[PDB]
Symmetry: C2
């Protein structure tokens, strides 16, 4: 199990993905997602120039030692580029270990805790009516849970995000959003009733007392979660929200370390932690985050956008299958070309994922095919207030 | 004036440096340090592929807007690669602003608060005796303050004892014993005080190797020697790690060279768990961000102690000396001399005299880069070491 080769693959079958592959002397290989949307080449360089050369000759079986070696050894700790590189290595090594054990990853983690993995779909429209049409469409596809978003009247742009080479510039009004958003949830409940799980993503745009107000306003509609209410580098930002509303709260897709959320969890300021495998240091780190969360009744809600590759999604479905405190798994379907580049054995049926049974995380990469889709630069948008203030997107 | 061009320069005049240069439509230019030791090319790519293209055509004068645009706009916030890229842009833009104002940077910041900037030098040796020899040598050069490190008997390799840490292509592997270090370290400080007396400022870098209660013990043990600071006692991603140390010793504490965000140290500062904040301009988001960190620190009597190793370029050092000259709550400035080749690649107007830095008077931060000279020294990979315990446990270096 000594590592004989390690290298990145960069491909764009609909959007950019970076993948790390590790091959052992025996021939067993593993892959890990290394995709960091809008900053992809920073991780590619971090891996190619600084991590990959140190992997050669290491015992691929020493997952924990390698994690600590890269985490502590980098000297400069944490961060999106850093932890994504570490996650890619970690995910490839767990893939290798599961293959060596002859087991699908969920078995190696402690076995199945559930028979299937509940997902939610994105439902978006310009008007509230447009959004309701999308909800109906997804309910018919078997989704038990939908995230709803609609345009704000008076505002040209509200939350494939990486649509432009350079960042697109959106304009935002908090006050108009706060008055309009509760109407969307009222309308969803009027048309679809109470059994549907309804989620909403605030996408970082509020202050705490504004989020508190929104949380209260939407209590009658019993949302599954209100996500990313406020920027949370200062974790105390959640406190006012939690003290003022019983609407459940989700946060953390932009986090990369347990140290970004330890206090959020221990103070019981959130209900769902959203940090995913690719950005949160892989299986090794996320097991620890999920276990900490479990002590405080917090459940997992992994970020699952198109900009995490099928490698992440497969591993996430395995993790979701084992973890006791599973909440929900986001599903944004990849393109057919992306699915072809990353063959996999996870299945989607009746609104749920089912883990694969192949040894490993069940995902591979077709390198020859990946090479036919060259990288194309694409950046995430930015958001400005009406006066031009650079805001949170 | 809009940005016409922006690009990185990577050079290795003794060790690796990455620099960002921004050029305006009028031809005026500014530079910023982008060097992240042992991970240099991650920052180069972050800048080259993702930041530089977004700078073209921007108003160079909009420093704050650019900082927020890069920080918030990245979506993934904070981190060493991220914040070093942002710092490089920020430093180059302040360089340009000061040149436009026709003033040295310290004047732009609020003017001078001091007539000179106290430094400390690194004194190191295998034995305590070897270290003392180095102290004597630096005292002779005019240093008022010294950091002292020496070998631990029974341990082959320890931090700060040979010094250029990134001295191998792949990470060197060192071995460590906490218990041997804890019993030996106080003997070094006792010896320094015996030979050199009480007026000298004496610093020591623990370099992340202790647990909180071990650092508490060390702090107490070294109280009689009145250290200027005991630095980086424990890894501090969990900021509460400092609490037991602070509750058990009056030895002053310094932390933060591995930090990149005010959010890495807000609680350390507000709870009064440290005396000096060490996060430097290059890794801490530049002048824009570090002004904010220093100001928060000032409310709690915390002083600046910018990390100043060889792996921050003369661009950072010059900007740091300007910052140090203005900031009210200045503590000390680390000085690790750069190589001749490095100083030639980065011509500068800061000066070192009688143990102190003096800020330049040229408009800008006073540092430039000679691109033709830089081109003579190609990048050469070098990684920081890792540290293992005697049983093989991957530890903190
Ligand atoms: Cl980073
Ligand atoms: Mg979201
Ligand atoms: Mg109360
Ligand atoms: Mg240090
Ligand atoms: Mg007490």
């Amino acid at each position: 199990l000594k590592i004989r080769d390690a290298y990145t693959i960069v491909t764009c079958p609909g959007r950019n993905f970076v993948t790390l592959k590790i091959v052992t002397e025996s021939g067993t290989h593993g892959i890990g997602d290394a995709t960091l949307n809008g900053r992809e080449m920073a991780v590619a360089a971090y891996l190619d120039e600084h991590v990959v050369p140190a992997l050669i000759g290491r015992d691929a079986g020493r997952i924990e030692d390698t994690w600590q070696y890269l985490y502590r050894g980098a000297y400069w700790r944490r961060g999106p580029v850093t932890m994504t590189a570490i996650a890619a290595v970690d995910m490839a090594l767990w893939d290798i270990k599961a293959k060596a054990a002859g087991m699908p990853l969920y078995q190696l983690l402690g076995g199945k805790s559930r028979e299937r993995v509940m997902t939610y779909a994105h439902c978006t429209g310009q008007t509230i009516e447009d959004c309701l049409g999308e909800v109906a469409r997804h309910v018919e596809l078997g989704y038990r849970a939908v995230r709803v978003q609609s345009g704000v009247p008076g505002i040209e742009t509200t939350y494939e995000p990486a649509d432009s080479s350079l960042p697109a510039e959106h304009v935002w009004s908090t006050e108009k959003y706060l008055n309009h958003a509760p109407k969307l949830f009222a309308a969803v409940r009027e048309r679809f009733g109470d059994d549907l799980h309804v989620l909403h993503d605030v996408h970082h745009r509020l202050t705490p007392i504004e989020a508190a107000r929104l949380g209260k306003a939407v209590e009658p509609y019993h949302l599954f979660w209100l996500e990313d209410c406020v920027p949370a580098e200062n974790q105390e930002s959640l406190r006012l929200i939690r003290e003022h509303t019983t609407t459940p709260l989700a946060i953390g897709e932009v986090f990369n370390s347990i140290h970004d959320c330890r206090e959020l969890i221990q103070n019981q300021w959130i209900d769902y932690i959203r940090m995913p495998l690719t950005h949160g240091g892989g299986i090794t780190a996320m097991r620890r985050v999920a276990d900490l969360a479990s002590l405080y009744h917090v459940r997992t809600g992994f970020h699952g956008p198109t900009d995490l590759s099928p490698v992440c999604l497969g591993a996430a479905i395995h993790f979701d299958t084992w973890v006791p405190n599973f909440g929900i798994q986001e599903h944004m379907p990849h393109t057919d070309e992306t699915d072809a580049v990353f063959p996999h054995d996870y299945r989607f049926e009746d609104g749920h994922f089912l883990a694969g049974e192949s040894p490993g995380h069940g995902v591979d990469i077709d390198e020859e095919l990946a090479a036919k889709y060259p990288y194309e630069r694409a950046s995430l948008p930015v958001n400005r207030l009406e006066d031009g203030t650079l805001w949170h997107w």
